[PDB]
Every structure is written in C-alpha cells, then in structure tokens.
C-alpha cells in the first residue's frame, strides 16, 4: 500500500518466486506481463504504464510487473524495427526508454496499491562482443539504478535466497 | 558442526574454495569429493560426480567434514555423459535436466542422512547476458534451478564476493 | 578517514562510481586517477607506476579515487600481449607482471595518508567465455580483486545503485 518494491537477480535465480511470495496474501493481483490463479487478472503491456497503474486501482490489489529487462528489450526493438541493431542510435533510444521509465515511476507514486517490479542483473559478466548486447547491458544497469532509487524496498535474490538491500 | 549442509556460491575465481576450506578448518578428517598433490594427509580425495549416496554415507563420523568441489562441473559432466561428442544443438535438455534432477535429489537425501558437516561449492553463472549458444543458454538455466534447490535444502548459504564471504542464509 | 583503503566493486553500470563519490564527498581535495566530475577534483591519467601519484606527501584529509582496476588489468594484458594472436599468449607470465603492478599499488596505498578508494568490476558471474583471452582475463581479474579486498580496510558491493558493506 503506497509502496514500491524492486526485486532483482540473475537468470533462474528464483526472483519470480520471491516476488510472488511478497504478494501471496493480496486478495487480488494485477499481473503485468511484458495459467495464473483465479484472483489474478493479467495485462500484457510494456509502454505507457500509467494507463494500467492508476489512482483508481483497488488498494488491496497488488500489482506485479514481470519484467523490466524485457520491457527495455521490447522498447529497443519497437524503436529499431527490423533494421540491423548494429546501426541503432542507442543514445536516442535510451532517451525514449527514460521517458517510459519516468511515466512508470510517476504512476507508481500516485497509485495506492503495492507495486512489485521484477528485473534482472545482467552486468556481472564480460563485456559483450555484440554491439546491441553491450548497449543493452549499460541501459539496463542505468534503468535498474533509477528504479532502485525510487523504490521503498529492494531485494537481491541469489540462488533462491532473498537479500534485502534497501 | 554435525548434521549440517552448507552451500558456498560465487563467481569465477571469487575465493569460494578458500572460504569453504576455512569453514572446515577444524575437522580432524575431511572427505574431498572432486567432480573433475598438495592436499593434507588428513584429507582423502575421491573422484565422483554421480550416485553420491555411495560416498556421502550414514557411517561417516560426525566430527568429520565433506567438501564437494564443485556442483557446476558435476552438472556439465552429466550433460556430456548423456550427450557425448554429438552436436549439443540437438540435445534433449528436458530429459537431461530430469537426469540431473535425479542425481541432485540423491545428493540432497544423502546429505540429510549423513552426520558430517557437508559443504557444497557451486558457481553463480546467471548474472551476464543471455548466451548466443543453445548449450550455454540451457546450462545457465539448469545451473540456476539446481542452485535454488540446493540452497533451499542447505542450513547455511554463503555468497563469496572478491574473496569476502557473505552469509545470506 | 585517513590511512584507509576502500574497495568498491559491482557490475557494469551498477552505480559504483556514484557510490564511491558519496564515500569521499567530504574530502576538501580529491585526486581522480583515470586508467582508461566535481570542479575541485584534480585528474591524472595513469595505469602503471602508481606510486608516482599515490605518495606519502598527500595530506590525510584528502582522498584519492582510482577508476578502475579492471581497465588497468586489460591495459596490461594488451600491452604485454602485443600484436600476435591472443590464443597463443603466455598468460602465466602476464599475470606475474600484473601481480607486480598490483603490489606497487597496494604498497603505495599503505604509505599514503589519504583515504584511497579503488573501483573495480565483478566480471565472473556469467558463463565461461568461448574466447581464450576473455577466459584468462576473467580469472586474473577475479584473483586481483581477492587480493585488493584482503588488503582493503572496507569493501562495498554495489547492486542496482545500492551500496552493501561486506567488509
């Protein structure tokens, strides 16, 4: 309730199971995807998220978004189309993503429900050889910093174990 | 201490082996399970990465310790045991993960019937970019699910970063 | 803090630099060493013979920020490797040379009255690289970070911009 939680972790780290546990007592759930239980309703959406995360949401309806990483990828390919990603203007693309993330953050601030955002840690390997992967890793890292600063709580999930770091 | 299962995880060359050794420094005898010359005399080494209940047994003394290095290599050994030298693009990774699940279940059950302190070393491999190779992508997912299962069974879990152990369970 | 060594580690674009700035925000003077910003900082570009910059003469109320260990490692590999195919390189000899340079750095920090903050990267929690140079870089960088953390008074892991004190 009037709370924003960010859950981050690596691939198959258990971060989705952890986020579901955070909201398991909510009478109802809105799942934003970028077979679910009966008291869940699902929406597929990765842009203009203030149209779903609104001041009219029932205060007892938890909102779970999975996941920020795929939102970023979807925005990049929406802007890039079918063109060769080697040629994308990643500076201009990140400005567009910054607008969408700012809409997301402003919407959470005005919504009475608990919002849980799931994201991925993608930056503790080696520098990618592929240009898109290099820029994606940088953009995802900056996006996660911004969301963590806005969040009231931040969990890092490692091998299924939650570590509360904010 | 006795009847204890510890998981130690971390990245490549993160110091997790030195941390694991520190955890069992006081044990009068150690069984070192190498999964594939300078070990102390009170260590015994056994090369094994399947049917581990045959080495991690109820008969082991409670004051001893068992160190397994490492879960990641056990997983890759099982993949290549089932796939051989064939093109890994074609492997049935669902069937291969079921076989790995069988062996990890035997390992967990064996630890829970063993009086020794068992320390399992594993690797975090999931915090980079999605691999562009089919085998690497599936291995990343399998390794992550295996580590979740071991951490849930463990009494203690350490994450070692730049040589520093962080107790997270 | 005077006569202190802090290590700050984390992934790419994890907010390490911002966290390190916060650690030294109360220093009246800062030396920034770039191995590849507030106006009062003075900058140097250096990744070798770091005892010429990190000296006993520095005042104890000052701070030194070095960014970053990872690039000093890769610069040394590329400098020592030369223009032959890196599949063929003597990585054992290269690591001995890198160890020598890290020893110079650690010793210089221990004779310096300033608070020295070293920024480095975690590069070891992905999949084993398919390239020999990248595999050896990953292993050397991991060992270097272990050595720096052991010598440091304080160690921070920065995740998604959030600093976690682990030593």
Provide the residue ranges of all domains of chain A, joining segments of one domain with +: 1-166
The CA-atom distances, in angstroms, between A37 and each of A26, A46, A150 are 12, 22, 29
**Helices and strands (H and E) in chain A: how many:** 4, 7
Interface test with A, best of C9, C10, C12 (most A CBs within 10 A): C12
Residue with structure tokens 């050994």? Answer: B77
> Which burial class, exposed, middle or buried, applies to B77 when counting CB atoms under 10 A from its CB (0-12, 13-18, 19+)?
middle
Q: What is the DSSP letter of A81?
A: T
Q: Is C119 exposed, middle or buried (0-12, 13-18, 19+ CB in 10 A)?
A: buried
Look at residue C118 and give its three-state secondary structure: strand
State the Cα–Cα distance between residues C10 and C18, nearest whole angstrom: 12
Mention every residue, 6+ apart, whose C-beta is less than 8 A from residue C11.
Answer: A121, A122, A123, A124, A141, B127, C121, C122, C159
CA pair distance A125, A121, nearest whole angstrom: 10
CB atoms under 10 Å from CB of B95, counted, come to 10
Which of B46, B100, B43, B98 has the alpha carbon at shortest distance from B77?
B100
**Residue C43: DSSP 8-state:** E
- Phi first, then psi, for residue B98 (nearest 5°) are -60, -40
Q: Do B13 and C150 touch (CB under 8 A)?
A: no
CA distances from A100 to A46, A74, A147, A148 (A): 9, 12, 12, 16
- Phi and psi of B60, rounded to 5°? -60, 140
- In this structure, what token pair is assigned to residue C49? 């013979």
**A121/C contact by beta carbon, under 8 A:** yes
Mention every residue, 6+ apart, whose C-beta is less than 8 A from residue C152: C5, C6, C7, C118, C167
Q: Is B159 helix (H, G, I), strand (E, B) or coil?
A: strand
Backbone angles phi, psi at C137, to 5 degrees: -55, -45
Query: Do C125 and C10 form a contact (C-beta atoms < 8 A)?
Result: no
Measured CA distances, A159 to A11, B49, C2 (Å): 10, 21, 38
Experimental determination approach used: X-ray
- As beta bridge partners, residue A158 has A161
Residues 6+ apart with CB under 8 A from C64: C30, C31, C33, C53, C54, C58, C112, C114, C115, C116, C117
How many angstroms separate the CA atoms of A141 and A148, rounded? 11
Dihedral-angle region of residue C82 (phi above 0 means left; psi in -120 to 50 means alpha; beta otherwise) = left
B141 touches A at CB < 8 Å: yes
For residue B134, which of B77, B168, B87 has the smallest C-alpha distance?
Answer: B87
β-partners of residue B49 are none
Calpha distance B30→C76 (Å, rounded): 40
Are the CB atoms for C89 and C81 separated by under 8 Å? yes
Q: Which of A8, A11, A155 to mutate to test the interface with B (most CBs of B within 10 A)?
A: A11
- A159 annotated ligand binder: no
Q: What is the stated resolution of the deposited model, in angstroms?
A: 1.6
CA angle A47–A164–A38, rounded 5-degree value:
50
Q: Which of A120, A123, A146 to mutate to test the interface with C (most CBs of C within 10 A)?
A: A123
| Rounded Cα–Cα distance for residues B140 and C93 (Å) | 32
The reply to whether C122 touches chain A by the CB within 8 Å rule is yes
Rounded Cα distance, C34 and C46, in Å: 6
Ramachandran area for residue B62 (φ above 0: left; ψ -120 to 50: alpha; else beta): alpha
In chain A, residues with a C-beta closer than 8 Å to the C-beta of C158 are none
On whether C132 is known to bind a ligand per the annotation, the reply is no
Assign A159 to helix, strand or coil. Answer: coil
Is C142 in the A-facing interface, judged by CB distances under 8 Å?
no
> C121 to chain A: which residues are within 8 Å by CB?
124
Judge whether A11 and B141 are in contact, CB under 8 Å.
yes
Contact A26/A61 with Cβ under 8 angstroms?
yes
Strand A28-33 relative to strand A40-44: parallel, antiparallel, unpaired? Answer: parallel
Extract the runs of DSSP E, i.e. beta strands, from chain A. Answer: 3-9, 28-33, 40-44, 61-66, 114-118, 153-158, 161-164
d(CA B55, CA B33): 9
Left (φ > 0), alpha (ψ -120 to 50) or beta: where does A14 sit? left
Nearest C-alpha neighbor of C115 from the set C62, C70, C73, C36: C62
- Give the burial class of B15: count Cβ atoms within 10 A of its Cβ; 0-12 exposed, 13-18 middle, 19 or more buried: buried
Which CB contacts under 8 angstroms, 24+ apart, belong to C43-51? Answer: C47/C71, C47/C72, C47/C75, C47/C76, C48/C72, C48/C76, C48/C101, C49/C104, C50/C101, C50/C104, C50/C105, C50/C108, C51/C104, C51/C105, C51/C107, C51/C108
Q: Which strands sit side by side in the sheet containing C42-45, from one edge to the other?
A: C42-45, C30-34, C63-67, C115-119, C4-10, C154-159, C162-165
CA distance A34 to A30: 13
Task: Take residue B169 and report the two structure tokens written for it.
Answer: 């369970």
CA separation, residue B61 to residues A4, B64, C75 (Å): 50, 6, 51
CA–CA separation, B16 and B9 (whole Å): 7
With left for phi above 0 and alpha for psi between -120 and 50, is residue C13 left, alpha or beta?
Answer: left
Q: How far apart are CA C102 and CA C144, in angstroms?
A: 8
Q: What is the rounded distance in angstroms from the CA atom of residue B14 to the CA atom of residue C144?
A: 10
Kindly report the backbone phi and psi dihedral angles of residue B70, in degrees, each rounded to the nearest multiple of 5, phi listed first. -145, 165
Residue C131 sits at φ, ψ, to 5 deg, of -110, 135
Cβ(C130)–Cβ(B133) under 8 Å? yes
> Which residues pair with residue B73 across a beta bridge?
none
Tell me the C-alpha to C-alpha distance, in Å, between residue A106 and each of A132, B28, B46, C116. 28, 60, 58, 38
The owner of tokens 């990267």 is C121
Give the residue among A112, A10, A4 at the shortest CA–CA distance from A65. A4
From A135, A127, A123, select the one nearest A93 (Cα to Cα).
A135
Whether chain C has a CB inside 8 Å of the CB on A128: the answer is: no
Distances (CA, A) of A139 to A65, A66, A107, C14: 19, 18, 21, 11
Asked if C47 contacts C71 with a C-beta cutoff of 8 angstroms, the reply is yes
Note the helical H segments in chain C: 16-23, 69-81, 91-110, 132-151
Give kind and range of the element (H or E) at residue B145: helix B134-153
Measured at the CA of A73, the angle between CA A72 and CA A75, to 5 degrees, comes to: 65
Pull the structure tokens for residue A99: 């607008």
3-class secondary-structure state, position B117: strand
CA atoms within 13 A on the CB side of C98: 30
């Amino acid at each position: 309730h009037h709370m924003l939680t960010l859950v981050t972790g690596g691939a198959r780290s258990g971060k989705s199971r952890h986020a579901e546990a955070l909201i398991a007592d909510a009478p109802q759930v809105l799942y934003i995807a970028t077979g679910r239980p009966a008291h869940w309703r699902t929406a597929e959406r990765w842009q203009q998220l203030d149209e779903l995360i609104t001041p009219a949401i029932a205060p007892e309806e938890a909102i779970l978004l999975e996941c920020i990483t795929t939102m970023v990828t979807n925005l990049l390919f929406a802007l890039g189309g079918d063109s060769d990603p080697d040629g994308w203007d990643y500076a201009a693309m990140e400005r567009a993503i910054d607008d969408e993330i700012g809409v997301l953050i402003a919407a959470c601030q005005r919504c009475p429900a608990h919002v849980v955002l799931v994201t991925n840690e993608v930056g503790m390997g080696i520098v990618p050889e592929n240009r898109l992967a290099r820029h994606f890793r940088d953009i995802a890292g900056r996006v996660n910093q911004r969301l963590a600063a806005a969040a009231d709580a931040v969990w890092l999930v490692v091998s299924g174990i939650g570590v509360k770091i904010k």
